[PDB]
Design an enzyme around this catalytic site. Structure first.
Site, PDB file in Angstrom:
ATOM      1  N   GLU A  15     -22.614 -21.551 -63.919  1.00 52.93           N
ATOM      2  CA  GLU A  15     -21.372 -21.805 -64.679  1.00 52.93           C
ATOM      3  C   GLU A  15     -20.380 -22.571 -63.808  1.00 52.93           C
ATOM      4  OE1 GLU A  15     -19.216 -18.455 -66.233  1.00 52.93           O
ATOM      5  OE2 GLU A  15     -17.984 -19.743 -67.521  1.00 52.93           O
ATOM      6  N   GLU A  44     -15.750 -16.044 -75.331  1.00 50.41           N
ATOM      7  CA  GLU A  44     -15.147 -15.047 -74.415  1.00 50.41           C
ATOM      8  C   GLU A  44     -13.631 -15.212 -74.330  1.00 50.41           C
ATOM      9  OE1 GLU A  44     -16.759 -15.668 -70.525  1.00 50.41           O
ATOM     10  OE2 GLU A  44     -15.885 -17.676 -70.391  1.00 50.41           O
TER      11      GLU A  44
HETATM   12  O1  LIG Z   1     -15.362 -18.136 -67.383  1.00 53.85           O
HETATM   13  C1  LIG Z   1     -15.396 -17.031 -66.859  1.00 53.85           C
HETATM   14  C2  LIG Z   1     -14.387 -16.660 -65.808  1.00 53.85           C
HETATM   15  O2  LIG Z   1     -13.250 -17.523 -65.870  1.00 53.85           O
HETATM   16  C3  LIG Z   1     -16.429 -16.002 -67.245  1.00 53.85           C
HETATM   17  O3  LIG Z   1     -17.481 -16.597 -68.011  1.00 53.85           O
HETATM   18  C4  LIG Z   1     -16.942 -15.478 -65.918  1.00 53.85           C
HETATM   19  O4  LIG Z   1     -17.632 -16.573 -65.347  1.00 53.85           O
HETATM   20  C5  LIG Z   1     -17.811 -14.222 -65.925  1.00 53.85           C
HETATM   21  O5  LIG Z   1     -19.061 -14.508 -65.301  1.00 53.85           O
HETATM   22  C6  LIG Z   1     -18.017 -13.554 -67.270  1.00 53.85           C
HETATM   23  O6  LIG Z   1     -18.827 -12.368 -67.047  1.00 53.85           O
HETATM   24 MN   LIG Z   2     -16.970 -18.616 -68.849  1.00 55.91          MN
END
Ligand SMILES: O=C(CO)[C@@H](O)[C@H](O)[C@H](O)CO
Ligand SMILES: [Mn+2]
Ligand SMILES: O=C(CO)[C@@H](O)[C@H](O)[C@H](O)CO
Ligand SMILES: OC[C@@]1(O)OC[C@@H](O)[C@@H](O)[C@@H]1O
Ligand SMILES: [Mg+2]
Ligand SMILES: [Mg+2]
Ligand SMILES: [Mn+2]
Lengths: 292, 286
Positions: A151, A245
């Site tokens: 990510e 999220e």
């Molecule tokens: O974007 C984010 C943090 O800013 C989330 O996706 C984070 O990476 C985490 O791994 C979620 O569990």
């Molecule tokens: Mn994220």
């Protein structure tokens, strides 16, 4: 590479700050209720998870699972301290084992460094340690039919890679069949030269997507060009996980809410937010992509 | 209040990572050559500035100056400890004194708290201490025909005020006529519900503007909706300082660059970046 399907996920942390019996049930029930295909389980501490109970709940709600995590200073695979890199390796293997046990096929998020605000730029030593850790993890996950998706996050949450292009360069170094780019619209909004460039560049190497508004509140109430982002996803015929999220200070671990600098809540009700978010996402990408 | 004119500035960190004789000349000459009206000097340590040399350079290049800074843990006027608030008050007075000596009329930026990542949410006491500190600063600056402009910045750079609306609320409590809102397109891109709402709400209370791309590199190469922003500025008939602000990992101030997490070399040619930035702004708000 292991098979990916177009499927929509709710981040567990939208509903629950922990994975207690009640936390696990609440989050799985929440993602199911909102009409998501899977829950993205936060494995920041994978030793906390009752895997037997969790698989029972996933079965009860007929919901699939993937997992994300961010490492910490104590498990940072960028570390110039070999013991800390090894502790990261150990946490990542444990997360892989939990994901595997739950029938999941995607481990994503900030798995390549400590999630948070580094006090200075990364050295090629930090970068070399991270790449090698992601090779060992990719190799461990490969026997278990698990893809890893790295990510890309903004400057305040990593110093390793902040754009899709940096992510692709990093993945050129990892050079593993089951390692993919993971893009997040909230992070892209800051770092990217437009919302389409990294998606078009990534093509088949885009393995995972996070949907977040510019301020991480209700989709469509901020500055993210979702129309541009989803146009790019359609162009590359993206058929993989898409998770919504957001992070409420009333729900999440203070460790995470303080790392993400959540000083104001943009929403009260997990169910209302997550339901509206999936409606918004399916308005942008479509009900389905099935052709005669 | 001391008059605000439509004038275009460049932030020192576009050219120079320090304010040595060499750094000052390079930044002032750079801003002059790009065609800016003023240089925005980063006064994070106002005791370090050679005022007499800086005045000589500003006169030599026929360039005006304003000043911006961030406080640190050592000078944080939100601190519940009066010893730290006192040190912040002192630094802000010194910055005002240097700006006065340089003939500048605007002290702006993150003057109301420590610039960077707070370990947890602000208390009402943190906020009350900051409001009181800005009242004392405003009163000190007023005597010198200097305006203070409180810069709303993103969650990772303050826990006090992340939106223009939060900014205007803080200023309502400060209640000083020479205290204004300072908006920055880079920070707005993260925190605001579009690029117009906060500008229209601020109106005459908007006292200073930073033009930064979403990634703080070349203007027009990121996600900032400048069309909506500049349309909103026109709506309120904004006539005040507009500074081009940009950070690269190859022109470094060891405190500021690391505090702002400037990891990428988004440019190498300062003159090219600064010339194109000024053209970009004037095309949209001549
Ligand atoms: O974007 C984010 C943090 O800013 C989330 O996706 C984070 O990476 C985490 O791994 C979620 O569990
Ligand atoms: Mn994220
Ligand atoms: O936007 C910012 C900080 O993100 C700048 O305005 C800062 O206050 C200034 O650089 C201090 O000199
Ligand atoms: O496009 C994906 C999707 O809409 O396809 C049809 C069903 O499998 C849904 O559960 C799924 O979310
Ligand atoms: Mg409801
Ligand atoms: Mg935009
Ligand atoms: Mn600024």
């Amino acid at each position: 590479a292991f098979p990916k399907r177009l499927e929509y996920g709710g981040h567990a942390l939208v509903w629950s700050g922990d994975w207690s019996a009640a936390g696990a049930r609440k989050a799985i029930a929440g993602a199911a209720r909102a009409g998501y295909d899977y829950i993205e389980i936060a494995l920041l501490d994978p030793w906390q998870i009752d895997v037997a109970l969790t698989k029972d709940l996933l079965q009860e709600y007929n919901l699939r699972a993937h997992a994300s995590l961010g490492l910490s200073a104590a498990t940072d695979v960028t570390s110039t301290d070999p013991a800390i890199v090894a502790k990261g390796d150990e946490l990542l293997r444990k997360a892989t084992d939990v994901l595997y046990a739950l029938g999941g096929s995607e481990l994503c998020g900030v798995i390549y460094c400590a999630l948070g605000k580094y006090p200075g730029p990364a050295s090629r030593e930090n970068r070399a340690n991270s790449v090698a850790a992601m090779q060992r993890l990719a190799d461990y996950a490969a026997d278990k039919g698990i893809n890893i998706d790295l990510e890309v996050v903004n400057r305040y949450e990593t110093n390793i890679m902040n754009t899709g292009l940096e992510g692709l360069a990093f993945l050129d170094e990892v050079n593993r069949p089951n390692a993919f780019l993971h893009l997040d619209t909230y992070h892209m909004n800051i770092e990217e030269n437009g919302m389409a460039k990294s998606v078009l560049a990534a093509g088949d190497r885009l393995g995972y997507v996070h949907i977040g508004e510019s301020h991480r509140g209700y989709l469509g109430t901020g500055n993210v060009d979702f129309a541009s982002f989803f146009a790019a996803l359609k162009q590359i015929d993206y058929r993989g996980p898409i998770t919504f999220e957001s992070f409420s200070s009333e729900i999440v671990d203070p460790k995470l809410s303080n790392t993400l600098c959540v000083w104001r809540n943009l929403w009260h009700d997990s169910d209302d937010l997550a339901g509206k978010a999936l409606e918004f996402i399916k308005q942008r990408y479509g009900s389905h992509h099935h052709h005669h």
